Structure formats: structure tokens, C-alpha cells
Design a protein around this ligand. Structure first.
Ligand SMILES: Nc1nc2c(ncn2[C@@H]2O[C@H](COP(=O)(O)OP(=O)(O)OP(=O)(O)O)[C@@H](O)[C@H]2O)c(=O)[nH]1
Ligand SMILES: [Mg+2]
Lengths: 210, 144, 876
């Protein structure tokens, strides 16, 4: 048992919010810098459920035309898909049918989740009443936002329920192994003291929802 | 769509490995990590959720075991040693800053500069008091 | 070559292998395209290769021929058409012989066929393609994979190519598709492929749908595939029906009665979730189309012409059988289910709300018996369905027809608020919130107001999902009570209203709700604050002590509340309707601008103390300071009751707050704050005027930072010069105006997106000139040395605004005010204004376009300037 792996392809336009969703799920952080990806980046994610561990291999692809690389050569042997669009720009939503078309012509009968990112921005341009693609294609739609962690775990939960088959599936708490006990050289201890001083000097970012 | 197939496993037994340990404290907090590898200093988020101070049943080792909300993935897991002292942040009464040499959140030890923040000053003071009690207990244990 | 290994490395998760393969393939494509394409097609056509290699080769060939960018696609097509004919012939022959040799369900050669065809068909370079595909489909001996691949290729070609290229061979395409879609096909895979191919090619067959003999055949085959014993084919055929209804609504009257109605109704009752979802989506789409047609008909009636299309009201005729099925599907729930899961139960509510909004009063009698029967059922599913349906039908029917129903059902809803089931309580809270929002005149009077308020206060301690809706209901209820005729009196404020008896308990309970250990869920805490700001805004003059106490306890939290100002985003509590945006935005501004009654300067003390404490705790820099700064402006604003004489706290901190120049939006907002603050008291701005002047001049002269800051800084220069000035002479404005008129207007005085900055800057400069003259005029006789009377001003203005003579861009409105103020100040200033008449007559033209907008703001100030000139001439 290779802890049950699956291949997930993340597709969408330029801004959208991929590689920020994946980065928030990987380490936990918000990237405010936009650096377009070249080709694809493969990141493993693990979740724990009442049936055991489930591992996704997220293939975060590039939504830019000139950085596409192997455009559709990534959606081969894929087993699940996420189509992401930005709710603050209607062009990102107009291209959802094209991404779906490119997905279906290479993969047959795979679970696909449609996600609308950047909900928290306000002055939203794609109102929730105008999102009808999931109704037409029998898809599962979610409103997420990687900044506020709103519904940010729902797509993986839905895909986990669909892939093994258990409409009553939950994320159980990750096992907590015993951390090791080690020691450091006194010079590195003094360096850590100086780093602690300079960190305590620095001010934490101002946020909320604690 | 649908992909319900064979890889559906059994139920097994779920063990959080927090057994054999007494929960001395539990509070909602937010964690930050100091990014000291990307040349210029910067503070990165690490998670939001319940931080606990778990004391081992017979070994008497106190550890911090914060977890993330709605995903239940560990964002902090390390022991407490006598040298660890909570320091106030820059003009904040609800945040503490400390340093550790072996953090096991990613199942690989990494030195970390952590900063925890609470909802109000009362929770911060309770956490600091319990942290000081645990540190003093560890120091007394190791002294003997 | 080892192209096979490179192709097979395109599925490796390792980054290095992917980059190596991509670089190899791009290099090979650049070196010699024809040989590369021939090698790829040779790799694809060999059955001995693995699936990965063949699909990768097919995708490479397809990507060499098409792109999402239209221009790149045209370039790639032209590049293909310029290759040598023999190489193209070899590629086409290799690709076309792969059909039927791929033993995997989605074929790759079909994409290559479609890509090559979309390039060669418009120039008739592949005339033996369509006959070959038709022969493959209609041959009785064709295998399963051959028919499936050819049908996929036909669908792709009809989906991608231009609609006007194959108009002469569409009939054979339709015949092949229908042959694959017929009932006698041994294989369900072929039927599924044919149904998908027809789905892809529904826009291409627009010309065929205008012929009855073809439309009947298409509809018959679709309505016969809806009965296939295979679920996938049924769903595909239902999707076909939905799209056909979307595209060809005008031709469905013949098939609506005998064929479509029964099929859709039987689909909505199916046990299989996909079939039921498609059956419900059919009628949701019908409602969407009929609402669009109703909008079109209303627009045509307003215009005064018959509508181009007339609706036929299918939903209005199917309501009797639609409503019971939907209300029955609303009972398909479970104890542990997610609210947003998109199952038939979720879709039924959306369809019911659509039907309500589409049919208005005709849906109430068809849904009342279900509510009145199952509202006390022992099974929680039926009670939940009853309250859910009651909530769904609330939008669209006339309020007068719904008031008796809600009045009758209010006690049962209050009782269900305490139902022993979580789901029922949640749905009941949602329905009560919707009643309070949509029907104000209903749940404020009279015999059930007190138990309703008691149940709401009790539910403020319930689960956060319920409490958010309770806060929403409280806010809407306070708004209704203040708006209602229960508010008497002509003193612009009610003496009392219906909530006066329970006001204190309501605000106390909301404040306690704010301090909850779980207030983050469903942004409950945020919602509370919003409610806590509505009630104090909509109150009466007998609960003012509670208002003042609540405002005092709120303003101490100002830092946290501003940090939460953008952390609402609706999506909870106040559903659907959302106004003024953001948590605080203007809501905090409006409540702070309205709460001011009976001096109550303690509120001002608390808010300014909190602001300065936040500023000091910032300890340098601070992006969020902007949110504070505008707030300060909002507490000066028109608050002269206790805030025209601020002059106590922000005066030493003005420069400190303005010190943050690294930010630009903050900079412009602070400039506006200075502009509106200088005209407040004009007493303690003197010490800081020179400091801010020199600092912002240094900032603007180098950062550049010219489009945004410069107009506002010059406007506030004029504004401060309105009252305070004299020691800065006139060089400061003169140099900047000369540079701007010589450079920013004499080069490219044209276009549309650039004239706005120019005209706004000119208007600001003229306003600043008038302000400088008025302030230096002393307002009594001259009260100034008057050395700058006409020599540097009158001479410069005629050569400054003359650039408008170049194009005379449309500067509508305020330019007339500028001309009027210029004329008035010049007349009241001195004698040498006649030289302005000696200048170019473009001012007259500047008047003419100015006179484009009627005569209110255009001719009044021009006439004022003219009469000032006439008075000067009479004095002359
Ligand atoms: N306000 C807000 N901004 C977001 C959010 N998510 C992403 N962004 C912004 O959007 C940008 C997304 O950039 P990327 O992470 O590269 O997203 P991407 O779709 O992978 O971009 P490409 O790969 O080039 O197509 C980030 O830099 C963020 O600044 C969000 O939830 N809220
Ligand atoms: Mg990216």
C-alpha cells in the first residue's frame, strides 16, 4: 500500500490563485508576490481520514500562454482535476469551458471540482448567481479563498470522498510523533540569541481571525 | 463525477498519539514563523488553531502540539527546555516570541523562531504563566 | 533519435526530467518542423508503442497546429500550409490510418485529425476526409473503436472549425452522427460517443434545424436515446435536450407536449442522482430562458415595438406537476450532511426559488398544502422540507398575498426555533431572517412581536450558524421598525418605536455575543458588530443612554473593528442584499456621523484617544494607517456640532501621519485630508503649513509620482492659500504651471484617456489661482503689496490655457466655473485685463463647448464673467 496515491491537475487562467492555494496547503503562508510558473510544479499533499492516509500529487500547471510548456501533455493518466477561476475578473470565468474541454478530451470520467477564488476581495465581479457551469456539467462547485482559509479544505475532502467512495468521510487528526531531543554548539546558540534579538525587534504582521 | 473504486480501505484504528499524556492547557492561538533563509528577514504565517501543553504520563516531558483548523495538520511540535523564555514582541501585550532548536512539524527537525498570538491579554497571560510553570518544572527535574 | 524515451518521460513527476524532455522537444521542433511532425505521426500510428508515447505524440502534433490565442493559431495554420506537400501528405496519411487502432477510450488521433482539418478544409486541401469518415461510420463491418474514434473526430471538427466552411456537407455529418446514435447499436460506448458528438456540434447544425424534416429526425433520436438502459447515455441525452432548449427555444412547441414533458418529469423522479439533477436542470434552464424573454418583452414594450421573440410559458403550464416533485425531493436529507454539496436536494431549492421568481403569485396555492400538512410531521425531514419551501417561496410573490400566511405561521416558526433537530433549527432561523428582510410589515406587528423578540434573544446563544442569522434578523427588524409608520413625529427622529421596551436587553446581548470564544465561525463576531451598528443607527429618542453606552464601548475597540473592516465579504449573515460594502467602510463613518446627539464629546475623546494610541503602537510605517486617516476626515466632515473645533489631538500628529510617503493611496488620501482640514479652523495649520509644503514639494519633485499626487497637491495648495498664505510669494505655483503647460499639454493634446488629467489639472490650477488671489486680496481693499496684480498673472494665463485652442477637448461643466472665476477675479483685481481680450478668442470656443451642458452651470458663470467685464468697461 503506497498510502493510496492520486494524480490531481490544477488548471486555470493567469491570476486565479494557484501556487498560492498549493503553497498555503504545503507550509501555511500567504504569498503576496506574483511569480508566474514555468511549465508545471509537482507538490505532494497528504491528508488523514477515518480510512487512512490519502496522498495527492498536485500538478500545478501554468495558465500563461507563453509559459505553457507541454500544454496538455500534463493531463495524462490524471485521476482528478480542479479548475480554478478568479471571481474578480470575468475573463477567468469565461475560459472555464475551454479548460474543461481540454481536460475531457484526454481523460474520461474523472472527478472535477470547480473553485472560485479571491472571494474575500469584495467588489466581486462574478456574482454567485452567474455561475452555472457546474449545473450544466454536473460538477461540484466551491467558493474558496486562500487568504482567509475559507472552504480551503473542501475540494480535497470532496475528491477524497469520491475517489475511494465513502459519502461519509472526515479528516481525522494527524498523528503526532515524538520530536527528537538534540543539542547545539554554544557558538550557534549565541547566533540564535542574536537572531532572537533581531526578530523580537521586528513587528508581526497585522491580521485577525485568531 | 464518480471514481469509487477498490482502493477504498477499511476503518482501522485511529490513534492521535496524544494518549499517555495529560493535557495541561488548551487555547486558540495563531502561529508565525520567522523566515531567516530568504536573505532579508520576514515573518511567515504557520497556522491557526488549538495549542496544547501536553505532559507525559511518567517521563514528565512537556511539549507544545498546536494543530491547524479544519485540516488537523500539525504546525508546531517540540519539547520545552529550561533555556526557552517567552519574550514580548514589539509593543504587543498579546504576543510572545521564542526560539527552538528542533521543531518536528514537518517530521524533520528544523531550528525555528516562532511567534504566537492570542485573542486578548488574559489568554496570553494564562499561557505565559503555564509556560513558566512548565519550564520551572523541567528545570527542577533536570537539576536533580 | 530516442524520441520514444523523451515522450515517455513526460509523465515523470521529477522536475529535471520534465524540463529535459520539454527542452529536447522544443529544440527538435525548432530545428526542422516537417521531419519532426513526420516522426511524431510515425510514432503515433504504430500499435506497438505504449499508450503514453502515442498520446504524447498526438498531443505534440495537435499543439503544433492550434493554440488558445487566435493570432498564434492563425500563425500556426499558415505555417502548416507552407510545408512541402509531400510531407503534409505523409502526415495526413499516417494520422488518418490510426483511427480504430487505439484501444483506450479517449482517442488521441482524433485531435490531430481535427487540428489538421481546421487548417486544410478552408482551402480545400483535404477533399477526401469527410467521405472517409462517413464511410467509416456507416460501414456495417466497422469495429467499435473505429466508429467511436471517427465520431469523436467528427464532433471535434464540427466544434472547432468555422461554421461556414462545411455548410455543403453538413447533411452527411448529421446522418453519420444519427446512425451512430440510433437504438440498434450493439455497443453503449458508440452511443455515448455519438451523443457527445451531437452535443459538440449543436451550433454547427443551425441551418439543419430550420428544416422540419431534419428537426423531426434529430428530436426523435434524442428522445429515443433518453430511454437507453445505460445511465451515461441517458445523462448525455438529457444534456442534449437542455442545450437544444437553450439554442432552439422557438422550435420546441411541437415536441413540448407529447415528448419532452413526460421524459423530464420521469427524470426528476429518478433514484439516480445524475438523472434527477439533469431533469431539474432542464426546468431551471427553462425558467432562465423565460426570464430572459420576459426582460426582452418588457424592453420591447417600453420601446414601443412588438418583441422579436415571444415566450410560451412552459413553467407556468407545468407548475402543477413540478411543485410536488420538488417538495418531495426536498426531504432527501441526512443527519450529517454538508449544506453545499450539490445533490438533488440542493438543486431542488434553487429550482423552486427560480420558479417563484419566474411565476410570482401562481406558485403559492401549489405549495401551501405541503407546508400546512408537514409542518408538524413526526419525521424531522418533512418539517425541514416544509420550512425550507416556505423560505424559498418568499421572493417573487406579492407581499400582500404573503402577509396573512406569515402572520398565521409565525407561532409555528417560533416553536420550530426550539426544534430538537439541529437542521430544523438552522433552516427555521434562515426562514425567519428571510421573513424579516423581505417582508418588513409582517414580522413587526403585532400579536407575536414579543415572543419573536424573546426567541431571537434566546437564539443569540445558539450555534454560530443560527446566531449569524439571528443578528441579520435583528438588523433588518430594527431597520423595518425605524422605517415603518410606527415611527411618528416630525422632528426627524421618532419619540419611540416598537423595540423601545427591549432595546437595552438587545444591545447588551449583542455585546455579549461579540465577546464569544467562538466568534470567528461564520464571521459571527463580525455580524454582531454590523448589527450593533444598525440598531444604534436606527433608534428612537427614548433609548439614547443605551445608544451612548454602546457607542462608548464600541469605539474603544476601534483598532480591532478597523482590522475587521474588510473581513466581512458578506457570504454569511446578511445574505443576498448587501449595501455600502465592507464592515466599517462608511458604516462606521455613518454610525459615527449619526450617533452625535447632545454634544456627547466623550465619544470624540474616546475615538481620538484610540486613534492616537493605534498610531503610537504602530511604531513607524503602517499600511493600515490609511483606514484611520480617512476615519479622522469622517469625524471632521460636516460634524461642526462638536468637530469644527478639533484643534487638540491630531495637530502634533499631522506631519507624523503624513510622514508615510512610501505609500501612494495613503499619500493622496492624506492630501485630501489636509485639503478638507485646512478649511476647518485655520488656526493651528500655520505651524505645519510650511513643513507640509516643503516636504510634499520634495516628494513630488523627485519621486514622480506625477499623475496622481500633483493635481491634488496643487488643489490643496490653492485651498490652503484660500485663507492662509503670503510668505510663499508666487514662484512655487508659477514654475510648476509653466512646466506643466509647456510639457504636458503642447506635445500630445489629443486622445481620450489623456485629456482627463489635462483638463482636471487646468481646472485645479485656475481654482488655485482664484484662491491665491482671494486670500492675498485681504478681502477689504488689497491688504497686500499687489506687485503681482497683473504682470505675472494676466500675462501668464493667456499663454497658459491657450493649449485648449489646439484641439478644444470636451471639458464639460466645471470649465464654465473656471472661466467665471477667472473673469470675476481679473475684473475685481485691476485694469490690464484688456490684454486677455487681445489674446486668442479660444475662450469663446471654451465657452461654446462649455455651453453644451444646458445653461445652469454653463451660462450662469459665463454671464457673471461677462457682466464683470461690462462693469470694468463702464469704470474704464
Ligand atoms: N487578495 C487575495 N489575493 C490573492 C488570493 N489568492 C491569490 N492572490 C493573489 O494572486 C496572485 C496569484 O499568483 P500565483 O500564485 O502565481 O497564481 P497562478 O494562477 O498560479 O499564476 P500563474 O501560474 O502565472 O498562472 C498572488 O500573487 C496573490 O497576490 C486571495 O485569496 N486573496
Ligand atoms: Mg502559478
Amino acid at each position: 500500500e503506497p498510502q493510496v496515491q492520486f494524480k490531481l491537475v490544477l488548471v486555470g487562467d493567469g491570476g486565479t490563485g494557484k501556487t498560492t492555494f498549493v503553497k498555503r496547503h504545503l507550509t501555511g503562508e500567504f504569498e503576496k508576490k506574483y511569480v508566474a510558473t514555468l511549465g508545471v510544479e509537482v507538490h505532494p499533499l497528504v491528508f488523514h481520514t477515518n480510512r487512512g492516509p490519502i496522498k495527492f500529487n498536485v500538478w500545478d500547471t501554468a495558465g500563461q500562454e507563453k509559459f505553457g510548456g507541454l500544454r496538455d501533455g500534463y493531463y495524462i493518466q490524471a485521476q482528478c482535476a480542479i479548475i480554478m477561476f478568479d471571481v474578480t475578473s470575468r475573463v477567468t470565468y469565461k475560459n472555464v469551458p475551454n479548460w474543461h474541454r481540454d481536460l475531457v478530451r484526454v481523460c474520461e470520467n474523472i472527478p472535477i471540482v470547480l473553485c472560485g477564488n479571491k472571494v474575500d476581495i469584495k467588489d466581486r465581479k462574478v456574482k454567485a448567481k452567474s455561475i452555472v457551469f457546474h449545473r450544466k456539467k454536473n460538477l461540484q462547485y466551491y467558493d474558496i479563498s486562500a487568504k482567509s482559509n475559507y472552504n480551503f479544505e473542501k475540494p480535497f475532502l470532496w475528491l477524497a470522498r469520491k475517489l475511494i467512495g465513502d459519502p461519509n468521510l472526515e479528516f481525522v487528526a494527524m498523528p503526532a510523533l515524538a520530536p527528537p531531543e538534540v543539542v547545539m554548539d554554544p557558538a550557534l546558540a549565541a547566533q540564535y540569541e542574536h537572531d532572537l534579538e533581531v526578530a523580537q525587534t521586528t513587528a508581526l504582521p497585522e491580521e485577525d481571525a485568531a | 463525477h464518480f471514481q469509487a473504486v477498490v482502493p477504498a480501505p477499511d476503518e482501522q484504528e485511529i490513534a492521535t498519539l496524544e494518549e499517555d499524556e495529560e493535557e495541561l492547557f488548551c487555547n486558540r492561538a495563531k502561529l508565525f514563523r520567522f523566515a531567516s533563509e530568504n536573505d532579508l528577514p520576514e515573518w511567515k504565517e504557520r497556522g491557526t488553531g488549538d495549542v496544547k501543553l501536553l505532559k507525559h504520563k511518567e517521563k514528565g516531558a512537556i511539549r507544545l502540539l498546536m494543530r491547524r483548523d479544519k485540516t488537523l495538520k500539525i504546525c508546531a511540535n517540540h519539547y520545552i527546555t529550561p533555556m526557552m523564555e517567552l519574550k514580548p514582541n514589539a509593543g504587543s501585550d498579546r504576543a510572545w516570541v521564542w526560539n527552538t532548536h528542533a521543531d518536528f512539524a514537518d517530521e524533520c527537525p528544523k531550528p525555528e523562531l516562532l511567534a504566537i498570538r492570542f485573542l486578548n491579554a488574559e489568554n496570553a497571560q494564562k499561557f505565559k504563566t503555564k509556560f513558566e510553570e512548565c519550564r520551572k518544572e523541567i528545570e527542577e527535574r533536570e537539576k536533580k | 533519435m530516442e524520441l520514444i524515451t523523451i515522450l515517455e518521460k513526460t509523465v515523470s513527476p521529477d522536475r529535471l526530467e520534465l524540463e529535459a524532455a520539454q527542452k529536447f522537444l522544443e529544440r527538435a521542433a525548432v530545428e526542422n518542423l516537417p521531419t519532426f511532425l513526420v516522426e511524431l505521426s510515425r510514432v503515433l500510428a504504430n500499435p506497438g508503442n505504449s499508450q503514453v508515447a502515442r498520446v504524447a505524440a498526438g498531443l505534440q502534433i495537435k499543439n503544433s497546429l492550434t493554440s488558445k490565442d487566435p493570432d498564434i493559431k492563425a500563425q500556426y495554420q499558415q505555417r502548416w500550409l507552407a510545408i512541402d506537400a509531400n510531407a503534409r501528405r505523409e502526415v495526413k496519411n499516417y494520422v488518418l490510418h490510426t483511427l480504430g487502432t487505439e484501444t483506450y477510450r479517449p482517442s488521441s488521433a482524433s485531435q490531430c485529425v481535427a487540428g489538421i482539418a481546421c487548417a486544410e478544409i478552408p482551402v480545400n486541401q483535404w477533399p477526401e476526409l469527410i467521405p472517409q469518415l462517413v464511410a467509416n461510420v456507416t460501414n456495417p463491418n466497422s469495429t467499435e473503436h473505429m466508429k467511436e474514434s471517427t465520431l469523436e473526430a467528427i464532433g471535434y471538427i464540427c466544434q472547432d472549425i468555422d461554421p461556414e466552411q462545411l455548410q455543403d456537407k453538413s447533411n452527411e455529418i448529421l446522418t453519420a452522427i444519427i446512425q451512430g446514435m440510433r437504438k440498434e447499436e450493439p455497443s453503449n460506448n458508440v452511443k455515448l460517443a455519438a451523443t457527445n458528438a451531437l452535443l459538440n456540434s449543436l451550433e454547427f447544425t443551425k441551418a439543419n434545424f430550420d428544416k422540419e424534416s431534419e428537426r423531426h429526425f434529430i428530436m426523435q433520436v434524442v428522445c429515443e436515446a433518453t430511454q437507453c438502459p445505460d445511465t451515461r447515455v441517458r445523462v448525455a441525452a438529457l444534456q442534449n435536450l437542455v442545450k437544444i432548449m437553450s439554442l432552439y427555444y422557438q422550435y420546441m412547441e411541437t415536441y413540448m407536449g407529447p415528448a419532452l414533458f413526460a421524459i423530464t418529469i420521469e427524470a426528476m423522479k429518478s433514484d439516480i442522482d445524475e438523472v434527477a439533477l439533469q431533469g431539474i436542470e432542464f426546468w431551471s434552464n427553462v425558467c432562465d430562458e423565460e426570464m430572459d424573454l420576459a426582460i426582452e418583452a418588457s424592453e420591447a414594450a417600453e420601446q414601443g415595438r412588438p418583441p422579436e421573440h415571444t415566450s410560451k410559458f412552459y413553467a407556468k403550464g407545468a407548475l402543477q406537476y413540478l411543485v410536488p416533485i420538488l417538495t418531495q425531493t426536498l426531504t432527501k436529507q441526512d443527519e450529517n450532511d454538508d449544506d453545499d454539496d450539490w445533490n438533488p436536494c440542493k438543486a431542488a431549492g434553487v429550482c423552486l426559488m427560480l420558479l417563484a421568481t419566474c411565476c410570482e403569485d401562481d406558485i403559492v396555492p401549489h405549495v401551501l398544502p405541503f407546508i400546512k400538512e408537514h409542518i408538524k410531521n413526526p419525521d424531522w425531514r418533512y418539517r425541514d422540507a416544509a420550512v425550507m419551501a416556505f423560505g424559498c417561496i418568499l421572493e417573487g410573490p406579492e407581499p400582500s398575498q404573503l402577509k396573512p400566511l406569515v402572520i398565521q405561521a409565525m407561532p409555528t416558526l417560533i416553536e420550530l426555533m426550539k426544534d430538537p433537530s439541529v437542521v430544523v433549527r438552522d433552516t427555521a432561523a434562515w426562514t425567519v431572517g428571510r421573513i424579516c428582510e423581505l417582508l418588513p410589515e409582517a414580522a413587526i406587528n403585532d400579536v407575536y412581536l414579543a415572543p419573536l423578540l424573546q426567541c431571537l434573544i434566546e437564539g443569540l446563544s445558539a450555534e454560530p450558524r443560527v446566531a449569524s442569522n439571528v443578528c441579520w434578523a435583528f438588523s433588518s427588524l430594527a431597520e423595518a421598525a425605524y422605517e415603518a409608520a410606527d415611527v411618528a413625529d416630525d422632528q426627524e427622529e421618532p419619540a419611540t418605536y416598537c423595540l423601545s421596551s427591549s432595546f437595552e436587553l438587545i444591545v447588551q446581548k449583542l455585546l455579549e455575543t461579540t465577546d464569544r470564544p467562538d466568534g470567528h465561525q461564520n464571521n459571527l463576531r463580525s455580524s454582531a458588530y454590523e448589527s450593533l451598528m444598525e440598531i444604534v443607527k436606527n433608534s428612537a429618542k427614548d433609548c439614547y443612554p443605551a445608544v451612548q453606552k454602546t457607542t462608548l464601548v464600541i469605539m474603544e475597540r476601534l483598532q480591532q473593528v478597523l482590522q475587521m473592516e474588510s473581513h466581512i465579504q458578506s457570504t454569511s449573515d446578511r445574505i443576498q442584499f448587501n449595501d455600502l460594502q465592507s464592515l466599517l467602510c462608511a458604516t462606521l463613518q455613518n454610525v459615527l456621523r449619526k450617533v452625535q446627539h447632545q454634544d456627547a464629546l466623550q465619544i470624540s475623546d474616546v475615538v481620538m484617544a484610540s486613534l492616537l494610541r493605534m498610531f503610537q503602537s504602530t511604531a513607524g510605517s503602517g499600511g493600515v494607517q490609511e483606514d484611520a486617516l480617512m476615519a479622522v476626515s469622517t469625524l471632521v466632515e460636516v460634524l461642526g456640532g462638536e468637530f469644527l473645533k478639533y484643534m487638540e489631538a491630531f495637530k502634533p500628529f499631522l506631519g507624523i501621519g503624513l510622514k508615510n510617503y512610501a505609500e501612494y493611496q495613503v499619500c493622496l488620501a492624506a492630501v485630501g485630508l489636509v485639503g478638507d482640514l485646512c478649511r476647518a479652523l485655520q488656526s493651528n495649520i500655520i505651524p505645519f503649513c510650511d513643513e507640509v509644503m516643503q516636504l510634499l514639494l520634495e516628494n513630488l519633485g523627485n519621486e514622480n509620482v506625477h499623475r496622481s499626487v500633483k493635481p491634488q497637491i496643487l488643489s490643496v495648495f490653492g485651498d490652503i492659500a484660500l485663507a492662509i498664505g503670503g510668505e510663499f510669494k508666487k514662484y512655487l505655483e508659477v514654475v510648476l504651471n509653466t512646466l506643466q503647460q509647456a510639457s504636458q499639454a503642447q506635445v500630445d493634446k489629443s486622445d481620450y484617456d489623456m485629456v482627463d488629467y489635462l483638463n482636471e489639472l487646468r481646472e485645479s490650477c485656475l481654482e488655485a489661482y482664484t484662491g491665491i488671489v482671494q486670500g492675498l486680496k485681504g478681502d477689504q481693499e488689497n491688504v497686500h503689496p499687489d506687485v503681482m496684480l497683473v504682470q505675472p498673472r494676466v500675462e501668464f494665463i493667456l499663454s497658459f490655457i491657450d493649449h485648449i485652442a489646439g484641439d478644444e477637448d470636451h471639458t464639460d461643466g466645471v470649465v464654465a466655473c473656471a472661466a467665471g472665476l477667472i473673469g470675476d477675479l481679473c475684473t475685481a483685481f485691476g485694469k490690464d485685463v484688456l490684454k486677455l481680450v487681445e489674446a486668442r478668442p479660444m475662450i469663446h470656443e471654451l465657452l461654446t463647448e462649455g455651453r453644451r451642458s444646458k445653461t445652469n452651470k454653463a451660462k450662469t458663470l459665463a454671464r457673471w464673467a461677462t457682466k464683470e467685464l461690462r462693469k470694468l468697461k463702464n469704470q474704464a
